[PDB]
Amino acid sequence: GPVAESWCYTQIKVVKFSYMWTINNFSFCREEMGEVIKSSTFSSGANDKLKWCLRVNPKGLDEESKDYLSLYLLLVSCPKSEVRAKFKFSILNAKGEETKAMESQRAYRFVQGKDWGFKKFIRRDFLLDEANGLLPDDKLTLFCEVSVVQDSVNISGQNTMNMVKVPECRLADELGGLWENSRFTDCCLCVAGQEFQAHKAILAARSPVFSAMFEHEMEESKKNRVEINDVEPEVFKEMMCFIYTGKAPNLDKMADDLLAAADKYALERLKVMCEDALCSNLSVENAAEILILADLHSADQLKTQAVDFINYHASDVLETSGWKSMVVSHPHLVAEAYRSLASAQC
Amino acid sequence: GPVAESWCYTQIKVVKFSYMWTINNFSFCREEMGEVIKSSTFSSGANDKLKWCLRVNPKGLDEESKDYLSLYLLLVSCPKSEVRAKFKFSILNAKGEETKAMESQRAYRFVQGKDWGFKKFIRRDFLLDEANGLLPDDKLTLFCEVSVVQDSVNISGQNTMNMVKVPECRLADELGGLWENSRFTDCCLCVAGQEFQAHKAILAARSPVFSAMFEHEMEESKKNRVEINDVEPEVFKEMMCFIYTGKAPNLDKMADDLLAAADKYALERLKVMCEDALCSNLSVENAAEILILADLHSADQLKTQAVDFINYHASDVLETSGWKSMVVSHPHLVAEAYRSLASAQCPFL
Amino acid sequence: STFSSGANDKLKWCLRVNPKGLDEESKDYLSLYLLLVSCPKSEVRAKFKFSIL
């Protein structure tokens, strides 16, 4: 494999959907042949405009099948013209491994209203036998993998290729490296008795709350000293770093007070990144104060995710003294928890 | 144990009523064939508007079932049009165990006043024989269980979904938003008549040449009476747009002057952008002009591309009078070109 | 992608590969061709050698 004076890299983009679909009390299919059990529509993050659904016929779709289980995949919404894909089904057995896996070798085309699948997927007696355990506790578990192909793209790595090195846009690093130098700072800025020499122009540029506060009767007299006491300097310097550099790398260690400051300052990106930090840290012991901070900071998504956590761990989260304190102090949170866990779930 | 990007859960709602009938002195059946004995109507809490009852024929429904006691389930009251349900009748013996417990494979459809049941239920003699124990104390202890199925519902879960669906970025949008709002008017630079506003720190950071004379401890008079004449105000506005918005959509038709302003301003990035734009602009007729511009602007990459261009394109580029004009005006260019050709072509006479 | 070298650089070529057979007469084949898109002259004489890594 010698060195090539020109190379090209043809990239057919592929994205993968992964799907589980469980039917309870399957022996009560409750009807005869031809009937269909649609599944709820499902997708992935990108592009999320292509929505798929499952059609499963418990009895035979055709007179040739009859004693056969048949599944199809059906595409309900396509923003493009057509989408080419390969599907692979497999029944999960009692333990959970993939059995009876059947796939289509062809990348079938897909239009809205067009469905493809396996009519002769698995024999009805083979399913209804208990010895193979293909129907554990009358629960039918189907796992489908969907592979969607997109356009190929060529990056054209032929050499000599404008051989000067091109830096990216330098608004962020140039502004970030000016803070330690502390140049072009027209005014002073002290928080909690500690001096942080910065200036009001770029802060007014990069936070509309603060600029609207600046132009209204403070820059005339108290421009030089501004009273900030809602945060410690360790949170204030992190927020100033986020304002200038554009990122807050020290996130996990102080995600909570950074979220509180971001709720105070209506910084939605800071709020959602601290929420992303704290979502993985959901635990039984911390769920109550997590809910309290979410309610105080009006993070509806975090409130919903913590509600789901309480739904999944309701056996032990309730008896915690933290949740008891949340009960005694926050009746509304418990009322909303009851509403979500009652109306939505059951 | 595969991990699913999305999971679904469809549950068919099953409600089970339970019911026990005892008729004392059953051998005193009081009647012949054609007799119908009903029981009291019964239900559970959910949804409590579904009323069922039992109807037994002790002798038989018809002449085929004379030696078969017949038992029927009858749905008397239903709010909906159809109720699909599956029934299982059984008879409890003297100990109490289920005997002749026969089920329905189908979830039969029921309506107001429609009956479905087992006519061929149990032999009359097998019921009447005391040794079977199915008539303890002359009490016929029937026991039925009925399961009504409902429309299934889809829970429609989606693990990790779209997370929190974050809003637009603020890395360089806020620059543009502040410029659109046009607030904090720090200075008013009047150049070629039209007035432009900008700030100090961002201009100093992006343009070191602008920061150079402002680092000389004089700022206010130079801001009040700034002298800008080497670059026209349209290119100045385009530079402002490239700094704040971050894009230069019409750079192709203004590549030359933007490159000259970048040369004046020591903007290596902007000079590279204009050079890359001018790379896909070479034709057969103005390659001499492009090479002259690259040589004047000291654009090494563009000059190398043009030198390769002329060296391959030599069969037709030297035909135009621009090459002869370059020969007349710039003898040193012909000298270095001939030196490069002689150095490259070491072979041949 | 259309390719050349830095010299001479006006003869542009592109590989047209066919994952299936091009024709049914010789099916079960990866028919690969070299196609000249850009050329200034009337003809070009060239020898090509294909290979798979």
XYZ file of C-alpha atoms in Angstrom:
748
model
C 0.000 0.000 0.000
C 2.113 2.883 -1.284
C 1.516 6.580 -0.729
C -1.197 8.012 -2.981
C -0.869 11.443 -4.572
C -4.657 11.699 -4.393
C -7.202 9.809 -2.332
C -10.960 9.891 -1.918
C -13.193 8.621 0.868
C -16.711 7.664 -0.206
C -19.002 7.684 2.831
C -22.521 6.249 2.588
C -24.098 7.507 5.814
C -26.033 4.949 7.866
C -28.103 5.447 11.026
C -29.427 2.703 13.290
C -32.784 2.436 15.018
C -33.177 -0.084 17.828
C -36.590 -1.129 19.042
C -38.289 -3.299 21.651
C -42.004 -4.105 21.612
C -43.693 -6.230 24.267
C -47.283 -7.497 24.179
C -48.820 -8.607 27.431
C -51.355 -11.468 27.696
C -50.849 -12.597 24.103
C -53.121 -15.656 24.305
C -55.934 -13.105 24.497
C -55.333 -12.000 20.935
C -59.147 -11.825 21.176
C -59.818 -11.997 17.433
C -59.475 -14.105 14.286
C -57.179 -13.917 11.258
C -56.176 -10.734 9.470
C -56.243 -8.562 12.572
C -53.410 -6.178 13.290
C -51.714 -4.884 16.434
C -50.120 -1.549 15.623
C -47.232 -0.314 17.761
C -46.561 3.235 18.853
C -44.480 5.255 16.402
C -40.751 5.386 17.068
C -37.571 7.000 15.694
C -34.097 8.220 16.664
C -32.635 11.651 17.388
C -31.628 12.494 13.813
C -33.356 13.313 11.667
C -36.423 12.458 13.803
C -38.724 13.302 10.865
C -38.864 9.650 9.767
C -41.415 7.793 11.894
C -41.787 4.013 11.769
C -44.322 1.654 13.299
C -44.844 -2.074 13.675
C -47.760 -4.091 12.347
C -48.033 -7.586 13.814
C -50.714 -10.042 12.751
C -51.189 -12.655 15.500
C -52.959 -15.003 13.112
C -52.258 -15.568 9.439
C -52.384 -12.577 7.131
C -53.008 -14.868 4.151
C -54.698 -18.190 3.520
C -51.266 -19.662 2.822
C -49.904 -18.667 6.247
C -52.801 -19.274 8.698
C -50.832 -20.966 11.503
C -48.079 -18.380 11.236
C -46.945 -15.301 13.085
C -46.408 -12.393 10.704
C -44.764 -9.026 11.330
C -44.235 -6.039 9.065
C -42.511 -2.688 9.400
C -44.442 0.291 8.072
C -43.134 3.818 7.507
C -45.754 6.415 8.364
C -44.066 9.758 7.645
C -41.290 10.627 5.201
C -40.208 14.237 4.546
C -38.092 13.042 1.632
C -39.302 11.094 -1.387
C -38.065 7.599 -0.582
C -35.812 6.009 2.031
C -33.870 2.783 1.529
C -33.313 0.547 4.548
C -32.705 -2.979 5.819
C -34.658 -4.431 8.733
C -33.928 -7.372 11.041
C -36.432 -8.870 13.494
C -35.810 -11.251 16.359
C -38.012 -12.684 19.096
C -36.477 -12.381 22.530
C -36.865 -15.646 24.431
C -37.433 -16.143 28.167
C -33.822 -15.375 29.102
C -33.435 -12.464 26.705
C -31.204 -13.601 23.865
C -32.198 -13.068 20.250
C -33.870 -16.128 18.705
C -35.500 -16.779 15.313
C -33.693 -13.801 13.780
C -34.796 -13.080 10.212
C -33.656 -10.154 8.077
C -34.114 -8.898 4.541
C -30.900 -8.964 2.523
C -32.314 -6.281 0.236
C -32.278 -2.601 1.115
C -35.973 -2.206 0.517
C -37.289 1.157 -0.551
C -39.831 2.874 1.662
C -42.582 5.366 0.918
C -45.347 6.690 3.139
C -47.934 3.928 3.465
C -45.580 1.214 2.226
C -44.884 -1.787 4.436
C -42.496 -4.713 4.172
C -41.905 -7.682 6.414
C -42.065 -11.397 7.056
C -45.383 -13.162 6.699
C -43.696 -16.552 7.152
C -41.746 -15.325 10.146
C -42.286 -17.987 12.804
C -44.586 -21.006 12.978
C -47.594 -20.624 15.259
C -47.081 -23.986 16.966
C -43.407 -23.132 17.467
C -44.426 -19.897 19.185
C -47.207 -21.498 21.230
C -44.985 -24.306 22.484
C -43.897 -23.719 26.069
C -40.765 -25.887 25.875
C -38.864 -23.417 23.694
C -40.029 -20.657 26.042
C -40.796 -18.320 23.157
C -43.788 -16.976 25.121
C -42.630 -16.424 28.717
C -45.554 -15.529 31.028
C -47.691 -14.904 27.916
C -45.414 -11.961 27.118
C -44.251 -11.587 23.527
C -41.059 -9.563 23.166
C -39.980 -8.387 19.711
C -36.666 -6.680 18.943
C -36.294 -4.964 15.564
C -33.164 -3.284 14.227
C -33.594 -0.767 11.420
C -30.667 0.342 9.246
C -31.333 3.386 7.059
C -28.947 4.312 4.241
C -28.408 7.911 3.136
C -26.515 9.613 0.324
C -22.865 8.866 -0.225
C -20.507 11.821 0.118
C -16.932 12.239 -1.080
C -14.552 14.395 0.925
C -12.036 14.558 -1.985
C -8.723 14.162 -0.192
C -6.603 14.864 -3.273
C -3.331 16.498 -2.287
C -1.804 19.995 -2.628
C -5.317 21.004 -1.659
C -4.752 24.658 -0.535
C -1.751 23.509 1.518
C -1.792 26.455 4.038
C -3.307 25.567 7.419
C -6.651 27.292 8.032
C -7.504 28.185 11.658
C -11.182 28.265 12.582
C -13.058 31.322 13.859
C -11.125 32.898 16.733
C -13.781 34.879 18.595
C -13.797 32.481 21.549
C -10.138 31.771 22.358
C -9.099 35.397 21.764
C -11.770 36.581 24.195
C -10.878 33.822 26.664
C -7.179 34.656 26.765
C -7.865 38.305 27.617
C -9.264 37.497 31.093
C -5.990 36.414 32.722
C -4.257 39.396 31.098
C -7.074 41.663 32.427
C -6.627 44.291 29.704
C -9.164 46.821 28.357
C -11.144 46.748 31.615
C -12.594 50.233 32.047
C -14.318 49.594 35.401
C -13.909 47.413 38.475
C -16.126 44.506 39.503
C -16.139 42.983 42.989
C -18.192 40.006 44.181
C -18.316 38.825 47.828
C -15.363 41.046 48.755
C -13.113 39.578 46.036
C -11.970 41.615 43.045
C -12.471 40.314 39.493
C -11.268 43.001 37.081
C -13.666 42.929 34.112
C -15.565 45.481 32.034
C -19.217 46.129 31.290
C -19.157 46.360 27.465
C -18.761 42.668 26.610
C -21.002 41.645 29.533
C -23.732 43.926 28.165
C -23.106 42.414 24.725
C -23.334 38.840 26.006
C -26.182 38.933 28.565
C -29.431 40.829 27.763
C -30.635 40.698 31.386
C -27.479 42.456 32.578
C -27.450 45.032 29.749
C -31.078 46.002 30.366
C -30.113 46.313 34.027
C -27.059 48.393 33.015
C -28.775 51.081 30.947
C -31.410 51.722 33.665
C -30.014 54.198 36.206
C -26.904 52.326 37.401
C -24.134 53.257 34.942
C -24.603 56.946 35.803
C -23.514 56.501 39.438
C -22.793 52.897 40.516
C -21.154 51.733 37.286
C -17.835 51.289 39.102
C -19.188 49.116 41.949
C -22.052 46.670 41.399
C -23.526 44.631 44.250
C -23.618 40.884 43.555
C -24.211 38.542 46.496
C -26.345 35.719 45.041
C -23.284 33.590 44.164
C -19.879 32.776 45.582
C -16.790 33.795 43.563
C -16.253 30.151 42.546
C -19.592 30.225 40.699
C -19.156 33.811 39.481
C -15.767 33.104 37.880
C -17.225 30.006 36.198
C -20.106 32.072 34.811
C -17.693 34.795 33.665
C -15.599 32.098 31.966
C -18.745 30.769 30.288
C -19.612 34.294 29.147
C -16.192 34.977 27.660
C -14.829 31.630 26.422
C -18.259 30.170 25.629
C -17.918 26.998 27.733
C -17.993 25.892 31.378
C -15.569 22.935 31.616
C -15.761 22.769 35.435
C -19.343 21.488 35.367
C -19.757 18.317 37.446
C -18.187 19.516 40.699
C -20.466 22.570 41.026
C -23.383 21.785 38.696
C -25.999 22.621 41.350
C -25.109 26.224 42.242
C -24.248 26.884 38.597
C -27.798 25.759 37.781
C -29.177 28.049 40.506
C -27.214 31.011 39.138
C -28.305 30.136 35.597
C -31.950 30.023 36.700
C -31.410 33.428 38.317
C -29.836 34.858 35.151
C -32.164 33.093 32.626
C -29.198 31.378 30.945
C -31.024 28.527 29.223
C -27.913 26.830 27.819
C -26.215 26.842 31.233
C -29.432 25.500 32.784
C -29.754 22.635 30.305
C -26.075 21.666 30.534
C -26.231 21.581 34.337
C -29.460 19.565 33.998
C -27.587 17.168 31.692
C -24.903 16.894 34.373
C -27.440 16.204 37.123
C -29.670 13.800 35.162
C -27.031 11.057 35.289
C -26.583 11.728 39.025
C -30.187 10.827 39.872
C -30.181 8.674 43.003
C -32.619 7.540 45.678
C -31.091 9.682 48.432
C -30.751 12.876 46.365
C -34.053 12.736 44.452
C -35.987 14.889 46.936
C -33.582 17.839 46.918
C -33.228 17.316 43.159
C -37.003 17.765 42.847
C -36.912 20.823 45.117
C -34.167 22.488 43.068
C -35.977 21.553 39.842
C -39.245 23.067 41.097
C -37.507 26.220 42.334
C -35.573 26.607 39.069
C -38.621 25.703 36.889
C -36.726 22.960 35.028
C -39.811 21.143 33.759
C -37.828 18.468 31.896
C -35.710 17.722 34.978
C -38.909 17.651 37.050
C -40.388 15.102 34.626
C -37.222 12.974 34.646
C -37.122 13.011 38.447
C -40.831 12.096 38.452
C -39.907 9.127 36.258
C -37.111 8.269 38.696
C -39.587 8.312 41.587
C -41.957 6.192 39.483
C -39.194 3.636 38.865
C -37.952 3.661 42.480
C -41.166 4.310 44.436
C -40.400 1.369 46.751
C -37.662 3.222 48.624
C -37.605 6.922 47.691
C -40.682 7.679 49.806
C -39.352 6.554 53.199
C -36.283 8.802 52.931
C -36.230 11.666 55.432
C -35.449 13.975 52.521
C -38.684 13.014 50.767
C -40.526 13.354 54.078
C -39.132 16.885 54.396
C -40.184 17.584 50.805
C -43.664 16.366 51.741
C -43.837 18.612 54.795
C -42.459 21.702 53.019
C -43.700 21.321 49.415
C -47.307 20.099 49.154
C -47.522 21.171 45.507
C -44.619 18.959 44.424
C -46.246 15.921 46.024
C -49.560 16.858 44.376
C -47.903 17.030 40.954
C -46.103 13.745 41.671
C -49.454 12.131 42.492
C -50.996 13.590 39.325
C -48.210 12.273 37.095
C -48.011 8.869 38.790
C -51.813 8.419 38.722
C -53.256 9.963 35.549
C -50.412 9.303 33.115
C -49.329 5.861 34.335
C -52.596 4.131 35.229
C -30.022 -8.436 26.482
C -30.114 -5.784 23.767
C -30.551 -2.115 24.609
C -33.361 -0.416 22.709
C -33.255 3.218 21.637
C -37.047 3.114 21.993
C -39.400 0.675 23.746
C -43.162 0.204 23.579
C -45.682 -1.518 25.808
C -49.225 -2.420 24.795
C -51.482 -3.852 27.478
C -54.869 -5.425 26.779
C -57.027 -4.624 29.782
C -58.581 -7.733 31.341
C -61.214 -7.509 34.090
C -62.363 -10.691 35.834
C -65.704 -11.141 37.606
C -66.217 -14.158 39.853
C -69.519 -15.747 40.769
C -70.858 -18.750 42.669
C -74.338 -20.274 42.385
C -75.722 -22.791 44.833
C -79.239 -24.120 44.441
C -80.411 -26.153 47.401
C -82.743 -29.130 46.818
C -81.663 -29.325 43.195
C -83.124 -32.822 42.767
C -86.405 -30.973 43.311
C -85.868 -29.347 39.923
C -89.644 -28.639 39.911
C -89.971 -28.951 36.123
C -89.328 -30.856 32.895
C -87.345 -29.773 29.783
C -87.786 -26.133 28.808
C -87.391 -24.812 32.346
C -85.102 -21.802 32.788
C -83.715 -20.843 36.199
C -81.964 -17.488 36.350
C -79.669 -16.203 39.083
C -79.254 -12.714 40.498
C -77.372 -10.107 38.457
C -73.746 -9.627 39.492
C -70.719 -7.424 38.802
C -67.534 -5.973 40.287
C -66.497 -2.376 40.897
C -65.011 -1.671 37.460
C -66.842 -0.445 35.677
C -69.922 -1.764 37.557
C -72.264 -1.095 34.607
C -71.653 -4.576 33.142
C -74.394 -6.868 34.447
C -74.211 -10.626 33.928
C -76.433 -13.484 35.030
C -76.625 -17.259 34.852
C -79.434 -19.274 33.282
C -79.539 -23.030 33.827
C -81.681 -25.580 32.009
C -81.679 -28.614 34.324
C -82.990 -31.126 31.800
C -81.744 -29.766 28.498
C -82.092 -27.088 25.858
C -83.219 -29.585 23.217
C -83.822 -33.265 22.543
C -80.107 -33.706 21.871
C -79.290 -32.512 25.401
C -81.841 -34.494 27.423
C -79.082 -36.278 29.348
C -77.066 -33.039 29.520
C -77.786 -30.240 31.954
C -77.205 -26.988 30.071
C -75.713 -23.808 31.510
C -75.702 -20.440 29.796
C -74.102 -17.105 30.528
C -76.300 -14.145 29.665
C -75.170 -10.521 29.508
C -78.142 -8.422 30.517
C -76.758 -4.869 30.807
C -73.921 -3.279 28.826
C -73.258 0.415 28.080
C -71.260 -0.234 24.917
C -72.341 -2.061 21.775
C -70.057 -5.080 22.111
C -68.331 -6.782 25.018
C -65.849 -9.505 24.186
C -65.423 -11.925 27.042
C -64.279 -15.445 27.829
C -66.108 -17.648 30.322
C -65.150 -20.713 32.330
C -67.799 -22.682 34.224
C -66.999 -25.276 36.873
C -68.775 -27.348 39.514
C -67.359 -27.576 43.035
C -67.578 -31.063 44.559
C -67.976 -32.070 48.220
C -64.323 -31.355 48.988
C -64.567 -28.247 46.817
C -62.222 -28.948 43.920
C -63.067 -27.823 40.410
C -64.707 -30.547 38.334
C -65.852 -30.491 34.695
C -64.182 -27.084 34.499
C -64.457 -26.343 30.789
C -63.347 -23.099 29.215
C -64.080 -21.033 26.154
C -61.226 -20.779 23.679
C -62.878 -17.747 22.084
C -63.599 -14.346 23.579
C -67.219 -14.416 22.496
C -68.953 -11.210 21.475
C -71.870 -10.281 23.736
C -74.633 -7.717 23.293
C -77.755 -6.714 25.221
C -79.636 -9.960 25.804
C -77.304 -12.414 24.048
C -76.411 -15.743 25.629
C -73.394 -17.988 25.079
C -72.847 -21.145 27.031
C -72.360 -24.877 27.190
C -75.414 -26.909 26.247
C -73.270 -30.066 26.326
C -72.093 -29.206 29.825
C -72.385 -32.230 32.107
C -74.052 -35.620 31.982
C -77.319 -35.739 33.901
C -76.446 -39.117 35.403
C -72.860 -38.061 36.161
C -74.302 -35.096 38.057
C -77.032 -37.179 39.685
C -74.732 -39.941 40.919
C -73.867 -39.420 44.574
C -70.579 -41.322 44.247
C -69.164 -38.552 42.042
C -69.706 -36.115 44.914
C -70.790 -33.369 42.520
C -74.152 -33.031 44.308
C -73.190 -32.478 47.964
C -76.225 -32.029 50.253
C -78.401 -31.722 47.107
C -76.704 -28.353 46.539
C -75.583 -27.730 42.971
C -72.496 -25.560 43.476
C -71.733 -23.885 40.168
C -68.879 -21.403 39.890
C -68.201 -19.295 36.810
C -65.392 -16.903 35.940
C -65.807 -14.294 33.212
C -63.010 -12.204 31.673
C -63.927 -9.143 29.607
C -61.205 -7.799 27.294
C -60.893 -4.120 26.401
C -59.238 -1.927 23.800
C -55.495 -1.967 24.276
C -53.556 1.212 24.954
C -50.002 2.087 23.935
C -47.732 3.501 26.632
C -45.296 4.810 23.966
C -42.025 5.092 25.825
C -38.899 6.604 24.341
C -35.707 6.298 26.378
C -33.400 9.372 26.160
C -35.888 10.750 23.518
C -34.673 14.156 22.307
C -33.330 14.983 25.813
C -34.205 18.663 26.483
C -34.204 20.076 22.896
C -31.803 22.956 23.502
C -32.266 26.436 21.963
C -29.943 28.176 19.514
C -26.298 28.815 20.310
C -24.790 31.871 21.978
C -21.126 31.506 20.927
C -21.369 34.320 18.368
C -25.122 34.988 18.030
C -25.070 37.515 20.883
C -22.556 39.706 19.022
C -25.063 39.863 16.177
C -28.023 40.472 18.469
C -26.218 43.353 20.176
C -25.267 44.801 16.779
C -28.886 44.588 15.586
C -30.033 46.301 18.791
C -27.202 48.844 18.134
C -26.760 49.690 21.823
C -23.728 50.895 23.812
C -22.586 53.356 21.129
C -18.992 53.704 22.287
C -17.769 55.650 19.245
C -18.971 57.143 15.964
C -16.478 56.617 13.139
C -17.278 58.811 10.130
C -15.536 57.350 7.070
C -16.488 58.260 3.472
C -19.513 60.087 4.901
C -21.406 57.065 6.224
C -21.228 56.528 9.986
C -20.301 53.167 11.517
C -20.378 52.112 15.171
C -18.159 49.519 16.854
C -16.479 48.720 20.165
C -12.874 48.817 21.330
C -11.911 45.447 22.826
C -13.350 43.209 20.095
C -11.800 45.327 17.324
C -8.444 45.278 19.132
C -8.638 41.496 19.546
C -9.643 40.731 15.951
C -7.408 43.336 14.257
C -3.901 43.790 15.747
C -3.286 46.679 13.324
C -6.294 48.490 14.810
C -4.951 47.751 18.296
C -1.483 49.042 17.332
C -2.104 52.794 17.238
C -4.686 52.548 20.044
C -1.975 50.997 22.246
C -0.056 54.298 21.944
C -2.081 55.807 24.864
C -4.253 57.877 22.484
C -7.765 56.644 21.801
C -10.400 59.390 21.967
C -9.062 61.764 19.312
C -8.279 58.879 16.951
C -11.811 57.536 17.446
C -13.231 61.025 16.886
C -11.135 61.667 13.746
C -10.165 58.197 12.532
C -8.527 58.186 9.095
C -9.596 55.205 6.974
C -9.061 55.627 3.231
C -7.204 52.518 2.004
C -10.360 50.361 2.286
C -13.762 51.441 0.973
C -16.794 51.485 3.336
C -18.501 48.557 1.569
C -15.513 46.328 2.365
C -15.419 47.891 5.852
C -19.060 46.866 6.388
C -18.249 43.417 4.999
C -15.366 43.136 7.478
C -17.771 44.124 10.269
C -20.225 41.457 9.063
C -17.463 38.833 8.905
C -16.327 39.738 12.429
C -19.763 39.753 14.067
C -22.004 37.403 12.057
C -19.106 35.098 11.179
C -19.951 34.692 7.482
C -18.914 36.429 4.256
C -21.515 35.386 1.659
C -20.450 37.690 -1.207
C -16.673 37.344 -0.756
C -16.159 35.915 -4.265
C -16.919 39.171 -6.107
C -14.929 41.220 -3.562
C -12.029 38.813 -3.006
C -9.320 41.187 -4.266
C -10.064 44.236 -2.095
C -10.781 42.095 0.966
C -7.400 40.407 0.440
C -5.698 43.817 0.169
C -7.399 44.976 3.373
C -6.315 41.714 5.029
C -2.746 42.417 3.881
C -2.953 45.875 5.449
C -4.581 44.511 8.625
C -2.272 41.446 9.001
C -5.322 39.154 8.897
C -3.790 35.797 7.972
C -7.155 34.020 8.290
C -8.992 36.520 6.061
C -6.117 36.499 3.564
C -6.321 32.682 3.488
C -10.090 32.867 2.923
C -9.674 35.281 0.009
C -6.813 33.194 -1.426
C -8.928 30.031 -1.212
C -11.774 31.890 -2.921
C -9.441 33.111 -5.685
C -8.047 29.591 -6.171
C -11.317 28.528 -7.827
C -11.309 31.620 -10.042
C -8.460 31.010 -12.510
C -9.322 31.128 -16.215
C -7.248 31.056 -19.390
C -7.373 34.812 -20.074
C -6.723 36.592 -16.748
C -4.139 34.230 -15.230
C -1.485 36.903 -15.809
C -3.593 39.393 -13.832
C -4.151 36.848 -11.046
C -0.411 36.114 -10.884
C 0.353 39.859 -10.814
C -2.143 40.323 -7.964
C -0.705 37.348 -6.053
C 2.866 38.602 -6.524
C 1.876 42.108 -5.412
C -0.029 40.795 -2.377
C 2.720 38.251 -1.483
C 0.163 35.416 -1.533
C 2.526 32.447 -1.594
C -0.112 29.725 -2.042
C -1.939 31.587 -4.823
C 1.383 32.369 -6.520
C 2.370 28.683 -6.349
C -1.002 27.653 -7.803
C -0.627 30.258 -10.562
C 2.963 29.146 -11.256
C 1.785 25.535 -11.674
C -1.067 26.894 -13.799
C 1.235 28.822 -16.131
C 3.783 25.987 -16.321
C 1.136 23.504 -17.425
C -0.949 26.071 -19.383
C 2.137 27.307 -21.250
C 0.820 26.144 -24.638
C -1.937 28.787 -24.534
C -1.066 31.270 -21.751
C 1.978 32.671 -23.582
C -0.226 33.252 -26.652
C -1.951 36.227 -25.007
C -0.267 39.637 -24.973
C -0.441 39.758 -21.166
C 2.627 37.516 -21.009
C 4.513 39.879 -23.338
C 3.388 42.854 -21.234
C 4.697 41.079 -18.126
C 7.955 40.451 -20.016
C 8.315 44.157 -20.827
C 7.277 45.546 -17.434
C 8.864 42.926 -15.131
C 12.165 41.547 -16.482
C 12.960 40.072 -13.058
C 9.875 37.838 -13.296
C 11.110 36.427 -16.612
C 14.578 36.058 -15.067
C 13.341 34.039 -12.085
C 10.958 32.032 -14.298
C 13.823 31.121 -16.645
C 16.031 30.249 -13.663
C 13.290 28.017 -12.224
C 12.765 26.328 -15.604
C 16.511 25.731 -16.057
C 16.825 24.369 -12.507
C 13.809 22.077 -12.961
C 14.923 20.833 -16.394
C 18.430 19.620 -15.626
C 18.244 17.108 -18.572
C 18.016 17.954 -22.312
C 20.337 20.109 -24.448
C -14.069 12.330 -7.288
C -12.301 13.733 -10.345
C -8.555 13.499 -9.825
C -5.263 14.414 -11.444
C -1.779 15.160 -10.260
C -0.185 18.481 -9.440
C 1.629 18.005 -12.733
C 0.377 18.053 -15.327
C -3.164 18.889 -14.057
C -5.631 19.309 -16.833
C -6.422 15.650 -17.592
C -9.213 14.803 -15.119
C -10.144 11.184 -14.544
C -12.708 9.347 -12.457
C -13.249 5.686 -11.672
C -16.707 4.367 -12.428
C -17.086 1.143 -10.497
C -20.131 -1.076 -10.662
C -20.878 -3.183 -7.569
C -22.980 -5.513 -9.688
C -22.189 -6.760 -13.160
C -22.356 -4.101 -15.846
C -23.861 -6.630 -18.268
C -25.664 -9.945 -18.007
C -23.218 -11.569 -20.452
C -20.527 -11.437 -17.760
C -22.515 -11.202 -14.543
C -21.077 -11.770 -11.042
C -18.354 -9.171 -11.513
C -17.049 -5.877 -10.130
C -16.732 -4.074 -13.457
C -14.367 -1.129 -12.955
C -13.683 1.561 -15.536
C -11.549 4.645 -15.896
C -13.328 7.575 -17.526
C -11.680 10.777 -18.746
C -13.841 13.789 -17.989
C -11.594 16.732 -18.819
C -9.038 16.817 -21.630
C -7.722 19.691 -23.783
C -6.335 17.605 -26.655
C -8.124 15.433 -29.208
C -6.833 12.168 -27.726
C -4.741 10.885 -24.826
C -2.708 7.674 -24.902
C -2.548 5.993 -21.500
C -2.158 2.573 -19.869
C -4.020 1.883 -16.627
C -3.561 -0.818 -14.003
C -6.258 -1.528 -11.400
C -5.667 -3.251 -8.073
C -7.466 -4.144 -4.835
C -5.865 -3.872 -1.400
